[PDB]
Design a protein around this ligand. Structure first.
Ligand code: ZAN
Ligand code: ZAN
Ligand code: MG
Ligand code: MG
Lengths: 714, 304, 197
């Protein structure tokens, strides 16, 4: 188990930095710390921890691989905090910030230092965990990786103030472990018995190995997600939307897990997953390429068997050298762009001739078809429900209660390699893993053979038992206000250009991209639940850079503004997102809801593309314009003034809308007369008249009037 | 083979459905138009030989006051050195004006130009009309609302397409289109949708492009080749498979309404290095008559 | 062979017409682009079908006229009634006099218990308005053209003595039909003798 020893010694190679910061070099401190625990006293682990630098470093030990992986990954005030990754993001345009994390966490820009007492607490926690909970073994490395993620995510990887301390200890350790695994696979494939002569003895060999194409950057993308999730019918579609989204998420996670298990790699090699997309870093071995080809073929066959053209997966990989990961020759972003272009080329020519011929070889007509997704080639049981459809329906009422997802030979919704996904609690997962081996368990947002997935599972109806029966339909149940559902579609702007070109060329590295991706994924899959607290909102999906929310319309707009503020706070102002907000009746077609909200969002993604579209194409405002110039300036005074009115001013607001829609000067005179007869504050009448006179303020006035009318209705 | 431009200006909004009665599509493929033409020929008791043997038609493409729009070719386009998201513009682009078509094939259309082209389309407005069914009320029941997704065109916008064939086929298509003006195309034709008026003329502006020779071929209609041509026509191809579905609209196919066999066809804009001649497939499952699905290929050659 | 008769004309609004469908209290259905009041063809088709079913009384003639989806006896709809759009002459007449196309009607509801009047606002099409209506009759059988047209005449008479949308028992939706022309646009059938209303 030399590979397992290398993984353990590469994930813990810089474990001595915490102890050194807790008051020789960090390698000796790490060796001494790991020598206190019997399971971690393996020769390879200790050699990797204490020998990974040139001055310190059997001619075949894994210490050389760990040293070169640390050099590739990386590219003194102990109290130095962790700098936010967005300090250098888009710094060529918006400048360099100085945001840092305090000991989820938001950077606050303030001047701070990490006290040695906090490091002592971290060291005590690590000492407790390494003995009471953690162990070594082939199947125990995932728990170690999750523990490292839970502990080291906000500790800086390096405290040197000469350069930018963006990368945390967890990101650096995970990237080093992934690179070490790839290099070990590459060396094993090349039958390199001696590691010192291959990598270390002259520095010329080190540079030459830096020249060699050792890694593969792999992109895996799902196609057909929007049509699968949102193009559904029936009155029970709102109760299955989140179930379909969760099913797609878990299928993507199972895809990446099977891919990693094929190559005998851990999840440290999974650079990014989310939004139907996945970036992985594999070895450049022939075994890896054959594994990738076989995986692509078998997943294409499975997706054709189960969904035909409804869903598909495209995989594209590119060979890469160490200087590409280190951006030594300015060829780092070119690698990612080429991978994306190869992925798009794969998505262009998607099927072979035989697959298309079998697609057109239909024997029997559709006959009966399912209520949802209107699918007829699959067998249809009673109640007109397809197998996948009824399995998804069975997944709900279990997803809202149980927090464990079991991929096992028996379950509800099919998954590749003849497996099935079901939802159970701890007892169910334990029984499932004990009955049949090769059964995998995922946990939902659970702090540290269980793989923890970060998902946004915030549903307001599940908080209260009576509203739990009617999931999304309960948000239209209200005493005042129009009974409507708001749909929010949010999307980050120019994220691809932010990754490719936003980071300066001096700071481009695999660790920087990994840290930025992890921060964005943590914000979307974890922080949205915290942001939306106490709101009538269900999150259909939240991952990648997109976001789909369905709730009460007023709650949706308020939480959209709150989300914009929180995203501005998180990204330090370097990232902006656009949004579309639609207002629909209950029983409105969910496919129409999604399509029209996507149209609104795409309307907002024009020009500056930092805008929000509101209910139609004529209400595309800015974020500050909507929050302040529409709600905090026009709607609040008018609402406060018209609350005194006996009828709340519904008819008078209707007359104002009628007068505002027309564009005649005599009708401006009519508006002035109506304001005079309103019997409200004279300064308010003057303000309203001025707002109606001015263009780009009459639209805001109309939006405020309509919002107030919706608020006071039945 | 003479190419005729048929322009359709729509009086009432149209309901072009993809899978639901709430879907409001702005166009129809060659399959829908050819099925409407076959239904019209059966209504007028004409021969089906010219439609089934010598008529090659394109999809229904948008047109506005200024230009005629052709489907976006599925070509490999190169962006800037660091503009990764700009490619999304070319992903959102669906129709390109004819004058700006060749420039797109040569790669001289930028991401901002692609966005300008995408926003320059002025076809019309898609809406969703909510209706009700009061038939159950008279039987001690309740009203049943439903939704119809319609699309209304702007005053000088509409849908054009190109027809290719001999003189007899062209004339028969003139009569069929004249009857189709009053039959209507799309969804609720009997409930106030799909009525249009069509004009058939020559197309010099399109004969300039259809006489062009190049290294790539672009599909102008939803087409698919038989197995023998599919063996060699799929190399280095960039296409998009569309699932053609639906129910059989016929009063004599069977007793009750049933669906036809699932079909898969290449999209309009798919680029091939081998030009395949499609055919008219049968999607009938042991019915009284054979339901036809037109998947012949109308080609536009170009230089990449 | 196959014939289609085009019946164009005007629907004149005798009393304010409200067909349900910014923020307006009970708005009327409108053209999405021009924002002009319309009379959906489905509304006219359903109202005439209900009136003819009341008159005759589904019955076979209703199935010939408005089509049927019944199993076995799948009947094609002979009547295609298009949406009635706001007339251009009525548009010019309403642009003159500075008259809006739609009016707001205020109504009360006096409670049977507390004698308290709940107000309610609806929107109607102004009585001076006219709508250009267009109907296509498909001659699938030549022998029933006279019967189909007398049924259409009965339905049109009932509609002229009925309303078209909204609450017409409370004085809404009264309309009149003026038949500008009845001309056979497709086929050789002679529709000169045919007449509606
Ligand atoms: N599990 C999920 N549930 C709901 N939405 C998701 C989920 N995963 C991803 N998404 C979102 O759904 C979209 C995926 O839609 P698509 O499958 O169409 N992928 P897209 O890039 O848009 O076009 P392709 O080139 O892949 O054919 C993502 O871009 C996200 O916006
Ligand atoms: N946390 C992440 N780390 C790495 N890649 C991500 C992450 N989140 C999303 N992505 C990727 O980010 C891309 C977002 O693509 P989009 O389709 O959203 N277009 P974008 O580049 O954001 O510019 P806009 O047109 O939206 O203004 C996806 O295609 C994903 O591959
Ligand atoms: Mg984005
Ligand atoms: Mg996105």
């Amino acid at each position: 188990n030399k590979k397992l020893e290398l993984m353990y010694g590469s994930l813990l190679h810089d474990i001595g930095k915490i102890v050194y910061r807790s008051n020789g070099t960090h390698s000796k401190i790490g060796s001494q710390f790991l020598n206190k625990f019997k399971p971690f006293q393996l020769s390879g682990i200790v050699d990797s921890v204490s020998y990974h630098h040139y001055k310190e470093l059997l001619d075949d030990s894994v210490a050389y691989i760990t040293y070169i992986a640390d050099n590739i990954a990386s590219g003194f005030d102990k109290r130095a905090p962790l700098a936010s990754i967005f300090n250098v993001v888009n710094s060529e345009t918006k400048g360099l910030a100085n945001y840092t994390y305090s000991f989820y966490r938001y950077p606050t820009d303030a001047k701070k230092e990490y006290t040695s007492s906090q490091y002592a607490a971290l060291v005590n926690k690590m000492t407790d965990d390494l003995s009471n909970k953690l162990k070594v073994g082939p199947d125990s490395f995932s728990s170690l990786l999750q523990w490292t993620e839970s502990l080291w995510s906000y500790i800086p990887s390096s405290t040197d103030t000469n350069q930018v301390m963006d990368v945390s200890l967890y990101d650096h350790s995970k990237i080093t472990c992934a690179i070490a695994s790839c290099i070990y696979d590459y060396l094993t494939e090349m039958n390199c018995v001696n590691y010192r002569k291959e990598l270390f003895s002259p520095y010329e060999k080190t540079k030459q190995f830096y020249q060699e194409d050792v890694f593969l950057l792999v992109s895996l993308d799902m196609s057909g997600i929007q049509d699968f999730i949102y193009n559904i019918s029936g009155s029970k579609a709102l109760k299955s939307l989140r179930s379909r989204s969760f099913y797609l998420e878990t299928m993507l996670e199972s895809l990446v897990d099977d891919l990693l298990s094929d190559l005998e790699l851990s999840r440290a090699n999974l650079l990014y997953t989310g939004g139907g997309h996945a970036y992985l870093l594999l070895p450049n071995t022939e075994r890896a390429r054959d594994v990738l080809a076989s995986f692509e073929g078998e997943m294409k066959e499975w997706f054709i068997k189960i969904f035909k053209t409804d869903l598909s997966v495209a995989i594209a990989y590119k060979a890469c050298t160490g200087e590409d990961l280190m951006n030594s020759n300015g060829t780092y972003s070119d690698l990612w762009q080429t991978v994306s272009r190869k992925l798009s080329d794969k998505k262009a020519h998607k099927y072979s001739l035989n697959e298309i011929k079998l697609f057109n070889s239909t024997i029997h007509a559709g006959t009966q078809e399912c209520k949802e997704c209107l699918r007829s080639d699959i067998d249809i049981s009673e109640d007109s429900l397809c197998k996948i459809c009824e399995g998804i329906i069975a997944i709900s009422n279990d997803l809202r209660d149980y927090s464990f997802f079991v991929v096992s030979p028996e379950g509800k919704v099919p998954l590749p390699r003849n497996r099935y996904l079901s939802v159970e609690n701890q007892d169910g997962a334990e029984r499932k893993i004990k009955m049949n081996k090769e059964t995998r368990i995922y946990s939902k947002n659970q702090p540290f053979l269980v793989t923890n997935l970060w998902m946004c599972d915030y549903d307001f109806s599940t908080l209260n038992p009576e509203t739990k029966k009617q999931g999304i339909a309960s948000y239209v149940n209200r005493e005042v206000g129009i009974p409507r559902l708001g749909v929010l579609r949010a999307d980050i702007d120019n994220l691809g250009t932010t990754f490719i070109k936003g980071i300066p060329e001096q700071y481009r590295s695999i660790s920087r991209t990994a840290t930025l991706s992890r921060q964005l994924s943590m914000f979307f899959k974890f922080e949205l639940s915290n942001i939306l607290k106490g709101a009538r909102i269900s999150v259909i999906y939240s991952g990648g850079d997109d976001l789909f929310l369905i709730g009460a319309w007023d709650d949706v707009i308020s939480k959209a503004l709150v989300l914009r503020k929180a995203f501005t706070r998180f990204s330090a102002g370097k990232l902006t997102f656009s949004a579309g907000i639609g207002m629909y009746p209950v029983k409105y077609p969910i496919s129409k809801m999604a399509s029209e909200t996507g149209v609104l969002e795409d309307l907002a993604k024009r020009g500056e593309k930092n805008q929000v579209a509101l209910w139609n194409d004529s209400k595309v405002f800015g974020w500050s314009q909507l929050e302040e110039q529409i709600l905090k300036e026009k709607m609040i005074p008018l609402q406060e003034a018209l609350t005194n009115s006996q009828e709340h001013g519904k008819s008078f607001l209707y007359k104002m809308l009628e007068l505002l829609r027309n564009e005649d000067q005599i009708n401006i005179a009519r508006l002035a007369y109506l304001l005079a007869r309103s019997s409200l504050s004279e300064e308010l009448t003057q303000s309203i008249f001025a707002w109606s006179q001015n263009k780009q303020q009459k639209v805001e006035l109309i939006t405020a009037i309509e919002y107030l009318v919706y608020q006071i209705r039945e | 083979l003479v190419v005729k431009l048929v322009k359709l200006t729509f009086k009432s909004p149209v309901h072009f459905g993809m899978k639901r009665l709430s879907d409001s599509n702005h166009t129809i493929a060659a399959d829908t138009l050819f099925s409407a033409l076959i239904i019209e020929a059966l209504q007028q008791q004409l021969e089906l030989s010219h439609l089934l043997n010598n008529l090659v038609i394109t999809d229904l493409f948008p047109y506005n006051k200024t230009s005629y729009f052709l489907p976006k070719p599925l070509i490999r386009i190169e962006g800037k050195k660091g503009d990764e998201s700009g490619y999304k513009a070319f992903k959102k682009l669906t129709y390109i004006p004819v004058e700006n078509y060749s420039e797109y094939l040569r790669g001289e259309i930028d991401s901002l130009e692609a966005s300008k082209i995408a926003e320059s389309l002025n076809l019309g407005k898609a809406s969703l009309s909510t209706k009700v069914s009061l038939q159950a009320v008279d039987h001690n029941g309740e009203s049943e609302p439903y939704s119809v997704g319609n699309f209304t065109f702007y005053p000088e916008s509409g849908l054009y397409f190109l027809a290719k064939g001999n003189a007899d086929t062209i004339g028969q298509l003139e009569i069929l289109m004249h009857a189709l003006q009053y039959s209507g195309i799309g969804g609720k034709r009997s409930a106030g949708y799909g009525q249009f008026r069509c004009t058939i003329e020559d197309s010099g502006k399109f004969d300039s492009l259809l006489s062009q020779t190049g290294n790539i071929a672009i599909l102008l209609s939803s087409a698919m080749a038989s197995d023998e041509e599919l063996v060699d026509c799929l190399e280095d191809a960039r296409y998009l498979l569309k699932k053609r579905t639906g129910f059989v609209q016929s009063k004599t196919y069977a007793d009750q309404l049933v669906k036809k066999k699932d079909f898969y066809a290449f999209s309009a804009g798919s680029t091939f290095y081998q030009k395949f001649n499609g055919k008219i497939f049968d999607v009938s499952d042991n019915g009284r008559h054979s339901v036809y699905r037109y998947a012949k290929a109308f080609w536009l050659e170009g230089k990449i | 062979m196959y014939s289609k008769i085009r019946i164009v004309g005007k629907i004149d609004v005798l009393t304010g017409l409200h067909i349900g469908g910014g923020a307006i209290a009970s708005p009327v259905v409108r053209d999405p682009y021009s924002r002009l009041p319309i009379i959906p063809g489905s509304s006219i088709k359903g109202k005439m079908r209900s009136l003819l079913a009341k008159h005759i009384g589904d019955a076979p003639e209703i199935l010939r006229l408005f089509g049927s989806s019944q199993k076995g006896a799948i009947q094609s709809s002979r009547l295609q009634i298009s949406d009635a759009f706001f007339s251009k002459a009525s548009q010019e007449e309403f642009d003159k006099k500075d008259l809006a196309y739609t009016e707001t009607k205020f109504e009360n509801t006096i409670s049977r218990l507390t004698a308290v009047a709940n107000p309610r606002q609806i929107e109607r099409v102004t009585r001076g308005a006219s709508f250009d209506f267009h109907i296509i009759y498909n001659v699938e059988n030549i022998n029933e053209v006279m019967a189909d047209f007398e049924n259409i005449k009965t339905a049109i008479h009932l509609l002229e003595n009925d309303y078209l949308g909204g609450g017409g028992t409370r004085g809404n939706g009264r309309i009149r039909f003026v038949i500008d022309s009845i001309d056979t646009v497709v086929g050789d059938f002679d529709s000169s003798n045919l007449s509606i209303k």
